[PDB]
């Protein structure tokens, strides 16, 4: 549910699949719950969803 | 499936410098870095061995900003990789692209290392797993 | 009151193979250009079809930098003194091997720099 | 490739021969050219 | 009047011959009288 962010993406397929190899999630593997990603850290997720 | 990890990818360009060849023969065109666990159960019961090949120990060549570069370096701010030949050749074709002197000069000295090659169908593919090698015992994660 | 306070280490050989090219000596530099020239050939198609021109392709690429980092290792009075040189400089010889240890910090993180960007240029296989 | 007189020596293997730029278009500069173009000269 | 008699000279020139070509069609900067500078840039660092 974000009107901007899906609309913010491009659609040239060459850059689409390679972002799936290294995307940044909104989750954090350094917290007890899914704390929404702290603005200083990287995650390097795969994320096909 | 394991042939399709290979052979769905296009090669890029060759160089006669990078001599990764098997002991007495065939060259190498693959890498396949995995973890030690996946390396274990794969070569145990899926693949074959032709090991201990010959590659270069000498780290790959040298670019120095010598008098060809160095003059162009500070005086104009221009820099050309190997201005020697491409200055020479383009001076001679001036008196009468196809520049096939990209890198083929000497084929420097090779030695023999513990290397694990596999035969994925056609290709001679290298394969090494490296945690205990260089990722061991630090606080850096494995990729 | 015992020895065996010693371990040894080095890492080369494969440390050049996966690297799969090298330019050494980057000077004070600002921009690195490599341009590509490829020529898609054509096929003479017959009949009432559009005429395929001999086509041309010229593009350029730029470098990135992504510099690496190195450790700090120096206490006090090894640089000074108070003559016990076979012990006082053997502290420094062990300190020189600490520099040799962070020389290993270039050969080891070398492949790490690759496997950062090697996963960067990779789609998933089922894609 | 950008400096065309540099590519008069290729000094390396044009080796893959796969459909360029239908891939990821990850190149900082690339030109899909037909038989000729005036900027080559 | 000193005289009415003069001894001038003939032209000078510089043409892109030695490495000035390579620094123009591969590099951008083309140094006037490059090679006398380019040698001496390889001469000063050993003094």
From Swiss-Prot, chain C:
Subcellular location, record wording: Virion; Host nucleus
Subunit structure: Homomultimer. Makes the hexons and eleven out of twelve pentons. Interacts with triplex proteins 1/TRX1 and 2/TRX2; adjacent capsomers are linked together in groups of three by triplexes, heterotrimeric complexes composed of one molecule of TRX1 and two molecules of TRX2. Interacts with scaffold protein; this interaction allows efficient MCP transport to the host nucleus. Interacts with capsid vertex component 2/CVC2. Interacts with the small capsomere-interacting protein/SCP.
Function of the molecule: Self-assembles to form an icosahedral capsid with a T=16 symmetry, about 200 nm in diameter, and consisting of 150 hexons and 12 pentons (total of 162 capsomers). Hexons form the edges and faces of the capsid and are each composed of six MCP molecules. In contrast, one penton is found at each of the 12 vertices. Eleven of the pentons are MCP pentamers, while the last vertex is occupied by the portal complex.
UniProt record similarity statement: Belongs to the herpesviridae major capsid protein family.
Protein's recorded name: Major capsid protein
Species of the source: Human herpesvirus 2 (strain HG52)
Entire protein: shown range: 62 to 197 of 1374
């Amino acid at each position: 549910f974000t009107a901007a962010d899906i609309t913010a993406k491009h659609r040239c397929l060459e850059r689409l699949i390679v972002e799936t190899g290294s995307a940044v999630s909104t989750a954090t593997a350094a917290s007890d719950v899914q704390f929404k990603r702290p603005p200083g850290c990287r995650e390097l997720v795969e994320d096909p969803c | 499936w394991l042939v399709d990890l290979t052979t769905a990818t296009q090669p890029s360009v060759a160089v006669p410098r990078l001599t990764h060849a098997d002991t007495r023969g065939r060259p190498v065109d693959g890498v396949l870095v995995t973890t030690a666990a996946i390396k274990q159960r794969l070569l145990q019961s899926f693949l074959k061995v032709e090991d201990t090949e010959a590659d270069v120990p000498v780290t790959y060549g040298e670019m120095v900003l010598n008098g060809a570069n160095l003059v162009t370096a500070l005086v104009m701010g221009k820099a050309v990789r190997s201005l020697d030949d491409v200055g020479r050749h383009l001076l001679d074709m001036q008196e009468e692209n196809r520049e096939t002197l990209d890198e083929l000069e000497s084929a420097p000295q090779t030695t023999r290392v513990r290397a694990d090659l596999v035969a994925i169908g056609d290709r001679l593919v290298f394969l090494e797993a490296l945690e205990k090698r260089i990722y061991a015992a630090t606080n850096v994660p494995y990729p | 009151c015992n020895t065996l306070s010693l371990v040894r280490f080095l890492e080369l050989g494969l440390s050049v193979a996966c690297v799969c090219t090298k330019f050494p000596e980057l000077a004070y530099m600002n921009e690195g250009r490599v341009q590509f020239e490829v020529h898609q050939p054509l096929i003479a198609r017959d009949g009432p079809h559009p005429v395929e021109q001999p086509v041309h392709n010229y593009m350029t690429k730029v470098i990135d930098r992504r510099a690496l980092n190195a450790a700090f290792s120096l206490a006090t009075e090894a640089i000074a003194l108070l003559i016990s040189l076979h012990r006082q400089l053997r502290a420094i010889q062990q300190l020189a091997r600490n520099v040799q240890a962070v020389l290993g910090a270039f050969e080891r993180g070398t492949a790490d720099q690759m496997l950062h960007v090697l996963l960067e240029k990779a789609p998933p296989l089922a894609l | 490739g950008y400096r065309y007189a540099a590519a008069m020596v290729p000094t390396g293997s044009i080796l893959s021969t796969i459909e360029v730029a239908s891939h990821r278009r990850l190149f900082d500069f690339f030109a899909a050219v037909r038989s000729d173009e005036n900027s080559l000269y």
